[PDB]
Design a protein around this ligand. Structure first.
Ligand SMILES: CCCCCCCCCCCCCCCC(=O)O
Ligand SMILES: CCCCCCCCCCCCCCCC(=O)O
Ligand SMILES: *C(=O)CCCCCCCCCCCCC
Ligand SMILES: *C(=O)CCCCCCCCCCCCC
Lengths: 55, 59, 256, 269, 59, 256, 55, 269
């Protein structure tokens, strides 16, 4: 029960785990998910770039 | 183990209506308390009990 | 395996058990509920605390003696100082509630006696001195039972309630109090009395300090007795639980 | 997983989940929902770490002895028992009968000894641990033919390597290991009384295959036991009194708990 | 009374008043001297965390 | 017309009635039965006396006093001298049984007390003197109750069992004996305790003299009390009935 | 002849055994089976919560 | 990946991507294309190395102590905290709450000590590292029964081998580890203030299973922490002032930045 995933490039690297605990697993280095509109733009009413902010 | 962050609460008992007994029956009784866990009880992170000590290997 | 004698009432944090009882006497056949949009006047949205207000508040115990005439507790004023029922009651101009009144009194097989547990809607009481009206401190007793009198109260220049039990402090016949929802605690067969009072009033909501809509009265019709040896201290404990309490008109706290 | 709480409301019936008769020898099954208004809560809590395998399956030191490079104590011997250590013994004794496989790990460690011996330049020490099942010939010296282990199992381990480990089956004659035994070994209700009538696992000998140096060296073998694939029956009260002997229940009476003052004191003293 | 069966008895008596306190102990199933040596408290002493409800059956 | 309080147990010649009780506590949820061909080792055919062995043997009565610490009866050894159960037990190397233990104790409405009736599988007991093991005559009492001690037994150079009740003679907490099948005889609600023990052991059959697999213990947690006038002599009678007794390995009689 | 089982979480871990004896195998950490009505409630006649125990 | 620039040309409208009102508490999203003529560029640049896992997932030394062959310091103990080291503490403190698994690597190193002791010929040292969760019995000597670890987890490691390593779960009671705590431990708003009210991870003891030689030897255990499988919430300003305590925010005030001369000086001073 292996898992072939991609390597970091600019191939694949097969992986199998041997331990019964998920804590015994390797780090999760390949999660490039992102969402800055929690911090950049946490405003209630939408702010459009091309429009005057205060109208 | 104790920690005030992890404080639990207090269990108290009070007389609601005093103990009424007839004549010729004892006026001082006893109550017994029993402790069991409910269906949602669970314990975590295994360690050694502080309740069993040893100075030398028993013989 | 059942029994008409067993019971268990759960309201909020509190549960109440009985191993000897009669039915639960439900108000005027009415079980308490909230105010309808059809019957409402106050346009502001109510606070209905729920589990915080409608729960079992056990006031002070009182001692039943071979010579006790009776006792009475006004209703909004009794719990006026108890928990969050008393708080909401102070911050709010208007309030509305029903109750589950559980009067508890246990004796033994060698003890005898019989109490009338009534709920008198609007127990407007009289004064000892005919010209005056009793004082607020004479009619009311917060969580501390006010007691009836064995014999006529003297009409000086007082504002004393005319407490003689046989007239119930209302100028009526105490034996006819049986029209108001009630039960009896005949020590021979009973152990407690439970009365579920619905909201009785001519207005949808009223102020809880200015007007006490119901008055609980515990009057012993057949006196406590027992032969020597039989335990002498027989207390009566009153446990009341608000039911479907709403509060309209929020402002600062108090009454004035 | 653990059970979730059900959303409860008020009640006014003759149903009494709270009143019972504890004389029946039956534990009540009341839950918060029965004596109060509960909210629905979803329990994801798991009782995984409290299974009997997780409780017992952890290496515990059960005993340890020493043997030397020279002198009289040149080889060691230990009659196998889990009762010499307070810690593991007490966990196993939560149950009357236990059945399991064992994982043996040994931590053998040597220490140079004080001598007037000059020019010491030790060679690597290799140790031999040998099991003599009940009945086989026993080593009477570091060099009796017995150490050939033609049929007895034995581990040869050179220092500096990973701890020697092997597993063992459920070696009992009974369909379960008996933790307690309220009986004798003789039909005349005489002789031995208790669990020792049952303990017959044999002995374990250890020795230095080589002396290694001109100076003195003393080694200390630590035996670790780890119950794998465990089955436990008929649970019992955990041990209150401290252990006095390794062969019997002998205890010195001690009080039920520690104390505090009044039954009203919210604090241990 | 801890060195006796009295540790187990909760004294109840016929008073000259109600509202009196019968007993009182904190909610610490593994720590309080009351619960620490119970079937629940001994098991709890082999673990670091705990969660759940508890039933106190009074007879 | 039924009642959870009534009972009648018929085993052989004997029948047992109860007019006040709790359920029958069945061993570890297991009801006694015979040994299966799957679990058997002894190849010889067994003797299963039936009605002659599996019947109600009522041992001696014991007196419950305001100061009694408790009592204990080893199990195969108690009935070792009683009837045909004791006979088969002597002529046979191996034996296997379960029991229906009925502890009886009736007082009145003015009496109080509460006994713990347990069945401790393998009650291996300790010695007063830490170096020795109790004597066979100190641990065992055929049909005559052996009793616990009020206070610590002195550790001389004896072979006395360390009887202090609070440690149950096993170095445990007497209040945790509740894991072993049990019942309580609260004189207030009870009249007797019935426990049906299945065969508990790590071997399919064992010798009945050399090993006592179960030990019955009656330890009063709340002492006998009564006001003067209330009858003082309150006895406890123990009635045990073997269940599904088989015997393998016949030879001459005895133990040695 | 491998066996892919689940890890402890809040994945999988493949396992193969190399030894001829079952005693040489790893512990059985994932058996969360349970039955307290051997000890809690070992009564002959059923006891319903909402009903009076003694009737 | 990073966003590519769009080819832009001239503009002459009432659209103002550059003028805003920063009072809104909203960060502007202007890009080069908005305030100039841009060329199309294809960005293959990746923000892979700046994910929270890559930032935090690297072994950092969090603490280290020493124990000896003889004397008083024969075993060591450390109450677990990531706050004794400036480096790892500061990275974790970029977030208010963090949740993660840990990878523990220990680098145990020994040094021979100065003595008048003649004929030293050390034997290989084996060390034992033991974890005592909050509540368990603590070793009061190098030889208290406590070191049996019948239930406590512990690593036995012989010198010269690869560094002992094991991973640990998210051991918190809360649904996330709290890095900061603006509160007390007592409801009377008293007692402890701050994160220490929350730190209760237990202690870590280490010792020499064997002395090994006649001469003195002192060992130094270095504990390394590596947050695997990390989740971090509510970010905050990186620590400016230097750390003063390991249990509290206590800082000594320092200026906003370093200086230069005039607001016109293109160079740091
Ligand atoms: C080199 C081979 C070593 C073999 C190790 C064999 C150890 C046997 C372990 C028996 C286990 C626990 C049993 C207690 C016995 C009893 O009291 O009945
Ligand atoms: C040999 C076993 C060693 C086990 C190592 C256990 C170490 C626990 C680590 C806890 C991690 C970081 C937590 C900070 C705690 C807090 O402030 O809330
Ligand atoms: C799915 O894994 C089936 C293919 C197995 C490939 C061989 C596995 C290599 C060694 C794994 C043993 C696991 C270690 C506990
Ligand atoms: C089933 O296992 C077929 C797949 C085999 C995968 C390779 C096995 C890896 C090494 C195993 C040898 C067994 C050791 C005795």
């Amino acid at each position: 029960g292996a898992q072939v995933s991609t390597q970091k490039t600019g191939i694949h690297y097969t992986n199998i785990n041997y331990y019964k605990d998920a804590a015994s697993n390797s780090a999760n280095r390949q999660d490039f998910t992102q969402d800055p509109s929690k911090f950049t733009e946490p405003v209630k009413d939408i702010m459009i770039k091309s429009l005057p902010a205060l109208n | 183990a104790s920690d005030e962050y992890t404080a639990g609460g207090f269990i108290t008992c009070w007389y609601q209506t005093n103990i009424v007994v007839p004549a010729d029956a004892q006026s001082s009784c006893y109550i017994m308390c029993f402790v069991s866990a409910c269906n949602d009880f669970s314990v975590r992170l295994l360690k050694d009990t502080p309740f069993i000590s040893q100075e030398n290997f028993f013989q | 395996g059942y029994s008409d004698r067993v019971r268990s009432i759960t309201l909020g944090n509190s549960t109440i058990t009985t191993q000897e009882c009669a039915n639960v006497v439900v108000g005027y056949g009415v079980w308490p509920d909230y105010l309808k949009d059809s019957e409402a006047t106050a346009e502001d949205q109510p606070t209905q605390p729920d589990v915080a207000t409608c729960r079992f508040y056990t006031l002070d115990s009182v001692q039943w003696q071979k010579t006790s005439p009776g006792w009475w507790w006004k209703l909004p004023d009794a719990l006026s100082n108890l928990g969050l029922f008393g708080q909401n009651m102070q911050y709010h101009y208007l309030g509305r509630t029903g109750y589950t009144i559980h009067v508890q009194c246990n004796a033994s097989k060698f003890h005898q006696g019989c109490l009338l547990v009534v709920c008198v809607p609007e127990a407007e009481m009289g004064c000892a001195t005919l010209n005056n009206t009793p004082s607020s401190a004479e009619l009311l007793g917060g969580d501390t039972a006010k007691e009836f009198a064995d014999k006529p109260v003297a009409s000086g220049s007082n504002k004393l309630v005319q407490r003689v039990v046989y007239n119930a402090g209302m100028g009526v016949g105490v034996g006819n109090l049986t029209i108001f929802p009630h039960q009896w605690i005949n020590l021979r067969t009973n152990n407690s009395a439970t009365i579920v009072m619905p909201y009785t009033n001519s207005v949808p909501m009223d102020n809880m300090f200015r007007h006490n809509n119901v008055t609980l009265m515990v009057i012993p019709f057949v006196p406590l007795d027992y032969c020597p040896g039989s335990t002498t201290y027989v207390p009566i404990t009153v446990t009341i639980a608000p039911m479907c309490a709403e509060y309209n008109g929020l402002r600062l706290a108090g009454h004035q | 997983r653990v059970a979730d709480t059900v959303g409860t409301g008020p009640t006014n019936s003759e149903a009494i989940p709270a009143l019972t008769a504890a004389e029946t020898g039956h534990t009540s099954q009341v839950v918060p929902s029965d004596t109060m208004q509960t909210r629905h809560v979803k329990n994801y809590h798991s009782r995984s770490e409290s299974t009997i395998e997780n409780f017992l399956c952890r290496s515990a030191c059960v005993y340890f002895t020493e043997y030397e490079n020279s002198g009289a104590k040149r080889y060691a011997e230990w009659v196998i028992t889990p009762r010499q250590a307070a810690q593991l013994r007490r966990k196993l004794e939560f149950f009357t009968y236990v059945r399991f496989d064992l994982e043996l790990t040994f931590v053998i460690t040597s220490t140079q000894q004080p001598s007037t011996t000059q020019n010491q330049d030790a060679q690597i020490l290799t140790h031999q641990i040998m099991y003599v099942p009940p009945g086989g010939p026993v080593p009477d010296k570091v060099d009796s033919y017995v150490w050939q282990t033609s049929t007895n199992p034995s581990v040869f381990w050179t220092e500096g390597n990973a701890p020697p480990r092997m597993s063992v089956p459920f070696l009992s004659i009974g369909n379960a290991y008996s933790n307690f035994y309220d009986g004798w070994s003789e039909f005349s209700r005489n002789g031995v009384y208790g669990i020792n009538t049952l303990n017959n696992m044999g002995t374990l000998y250890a020795r230095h295959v080589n002396a290694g140096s001109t100076g003195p060296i003393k080694s200390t073998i630590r035996i670790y036991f780890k119950p794998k694939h465990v089955k436990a029956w008929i649970p019992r009260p955990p041990r209150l009194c401290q252990y006095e002997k390794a062969k019997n229940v002998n205890f010195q009476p001690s009080g039920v708990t520690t104390t505090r003052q009044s039954i009203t004191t919210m604090t241990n003293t | 009374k801890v060195n006796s069966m009295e540790a187990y008895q909760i004294p109840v008596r016929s008073n000259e008043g109600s509202g009196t306190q019968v007993f009182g102990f904190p909610l610490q199933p593994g720590y309080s001297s009351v619960f620490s040596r119970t079937l629940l408290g001994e098991i709890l002493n082999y673990y670091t965390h705990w969660s759940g409800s508890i039933k106190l059956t009074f007879m």
